[PDB]
Amino acid sequence: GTVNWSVEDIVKGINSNNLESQLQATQAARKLLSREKQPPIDNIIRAGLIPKFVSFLGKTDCSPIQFESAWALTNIASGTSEQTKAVVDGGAIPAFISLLASPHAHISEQAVWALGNIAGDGSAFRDLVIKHGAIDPLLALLAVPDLSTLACGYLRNLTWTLSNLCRNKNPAPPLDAVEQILPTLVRLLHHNDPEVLADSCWAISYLTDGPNERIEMVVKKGVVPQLVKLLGATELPIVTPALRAIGNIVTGTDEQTQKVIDAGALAVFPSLLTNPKTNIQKEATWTMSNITAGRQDQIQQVVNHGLVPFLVGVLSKADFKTQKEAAWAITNYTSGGTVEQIVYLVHCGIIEPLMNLLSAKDTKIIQVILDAISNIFQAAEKLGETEKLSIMIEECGGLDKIEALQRHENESVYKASLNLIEKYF
């Protein structure tokens, strides 16, 4: 009945003086905008339909046209920035916010969805949705004794929209909006649905992606232990954002990093550092590098949890981007570690795989590795064992690489190479 109309028929119906004709034409628009292959968004916009849809959102008297127009506008708003802008320019934001209070669950849900697409465009529209007062009525929809009594699709859409209100930087969301949302987020983070859990974790990852003051707001809410629990989940879509959030937190202060250690995160790293998904290995190693950039007592926890052999493992064999994060983890470890911690590193076999990485055609990892060698030498000096170390590097082909690097395009590379050579070889 409302299948495969032309835009001109849609326009004719919507321009009729007849609410039922308008409803049928709006549903036909919804079906057009709902098809997988190239929905004619720009055609619908060019026909001048957005203002009509927006006015239909206000017809409390005709809940079906509210729904159909909400869905049509949702799909227009899901398009390019310019398409989302056309929806916002039509006055849709306050109209959708009014629909959050609808007695019809399917209509409020659609308003939630539409607002998520709008906010999802970027920080300006995100902040404009917030200024129009979206947060209170959204949070009210989740103010129930037990989340499990809500429809699953409904709760998933709400969680997703809230996560978009937490998303993007330049600038990050308003501090007071974040404080307003966080308690609900913490509660969703304890829900049992994997998709709600995944999107909640993503939201927490966005909020921890910034300066220490932002990390602190989250850490203060006591969520780190739950994040560490989620870090051990079987579902990759949960582990990925849980690990991103943990990684973000350890870019903060040593005290913030310690909360992650206290929560038990390190015991999960044997698995993460050998995870068959390369993204996970890379991000786990990145996280380790910011832990080895901390205090000597924190480095010692890395040692105690048996994680140095896992770092040697990743340095020995991994996707190259992971190997680069491992090199960083090693340079950090050697920069900040005691002599005894640094010795331990050598005994775990760090030298050969470090040397093997010197043949990389990546200038930055070479600098990083050379720096590690210097720090390791520095430690052997304090023990008067620099000759034993020189032989080791000599015996595994390390010297051939360092000597050959003396004649290298980069300046500080050739500098460090020649320095190492003359100072120790």
Binding site: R35, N75, S163
Partner: peptide
């Protein structure tokens, strides 16, 4: 990472 934007499809 989640989609920034999602249409509701048939």
């Amino acid at each position: 990472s989640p989609r920034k934007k999602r249409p509701r499809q048939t």
